[PDB]
Enzyme design. Structure first.
Site, PDB file in Angstrom:
ATOM      1  N   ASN A  62      -3.056   8.049  44.809  1.00  0.00           N
ATOM      2  CA  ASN A  62      -2.595   8.746  46.008  1.00  0.00           C
ATOM      3  C   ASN A  62      -2.331  10.207  45.729  1.00  0.00           C
ATOM      4  O   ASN A  62      -2.141  10.598  44.584  1.00  0.00           O
ATOM      5  CB  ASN A  62      -1.313   8.118  46.536  1.00  0.00           C
ATOM      6  CG  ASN A  62      -1.474   6.658  46.842  1.00  0.00           C
ATOM      7  OD1 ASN A  62      -0.696   5.836  46.382  1.00  0.00           O
ATOM      8  ND2 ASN A  62      -2.490   6.326  47.623  1.00  0.00           N
ATOM      9  N   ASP A 103      -1.991   2.767  44.020  1.00  0.00           N
ATOM     10  CA  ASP A 103      -1.989   1.470  44.701  1.00  0.00           C
ATOM     11  C   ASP A 103      -2.761   0.458  43.877  1.00  0.00           C
ATOM     12  O   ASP A 103      -3.843   0.767  43.347  1.00  0.00           O
ATOM     13  CB  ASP A 103      -2.645   1.575  46.074  1.00  0.00           C
ATOM     14  CG  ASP A 103      -2.083   2.704  46.886  1.00  0.00           C
ATOM     15  OD1 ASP A 103      -0.846   2.847  46.949  1.00  0.00           O
ATOM     16  OD2 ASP A 103      -2.897   3.481  47.433  1.00  0.00           O
ATOM     17  N   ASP A 124       0.250  11.950  46.151  1.00  0.00           N
ATOM     18  CA  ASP A 124       1.568  12.202  45.570  1.00  0.00           C
ATOM     19  C   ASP A 124       1.657  11.822  44.091  1.00  0.00           C
ATOM     20  O   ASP A 124       2.686  12.030  43.454  1.00  0.00           O
ATOM     21  CB  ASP A 124       2.676  11.518  46.390  1.00  0.00           C
ATOM     22  CG  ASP A 124       2.696  10.004  46.225  1.00  0.00           C
ATOM     23  OD1 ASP A 124       1.730   9.435  45.674  1.00  0.00           O
ATOM     24  OD2 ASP A 124       3.681   9.373  46.660  1.00  0.00           O
TER      25      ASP A 124
END
Ligand code: CL
Ligand code: CL
Ligand code: CL
Length: 129
Positions: A46, A52, A48
């Site tokens: 991701n 996942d 940030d």
């Protein structure tokens, strides 16, 4: 492991996900389809810096430990690698916590965008369950 559609439905049911928090089995299968294409080894990085993991693309910012997501939590108390196993137990148990966190299956943005409100029963149609 890449699950078959009905094979995954059966595994999810065996692990008590069917109608968990009111979400029918088709919801869970639909979510897994669009999160991972039924592949337990799916990973995605991701923006940030979190990652996942697994069939339900559970995120290291909150739910598991991967050692490389600064300031994150591990609320399922598992290494993120456990979410990649051919055995979906860890993913299911963690998903139960996630879906109970307040926003139901909206926690999975892909469920909200691609499954919510659709004929999700199609995902388990024909399955011996
Ligand atoms: Cl369903
Ligand atoms: Cl970390
Ligand atoms: Cl999406």
């Amino acid at each position: 492991k890449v699950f078959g559609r009905c094979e995954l439905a059966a595994a999810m049911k065996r692990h008590g996900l069917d109608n968990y928090r009111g979400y029918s089995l088709g919801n869970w299968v639909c979510a897994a389809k669009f999160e991972s294409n039924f592949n337990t080894q799916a990973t995605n990085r991701n923006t940030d810096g979190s990652t996942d993991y697994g069939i339900l693309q559970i995120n290291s910012r909150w739910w598991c430990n991967d050692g490389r997501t600064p300031g994150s939590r591990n609320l399922c108390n598992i290494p993120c690698s456990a979410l990649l196993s051919s055995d979906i137990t860890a993913s299911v148990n963690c998903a139960k916590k996630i879906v109970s966190d307040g926003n139901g299956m909206n926690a999975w943005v892909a469920w909200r965008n691609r499954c919510k409100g659709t004929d999700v029963q199609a995902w388990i149609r024909g399955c011996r369950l």
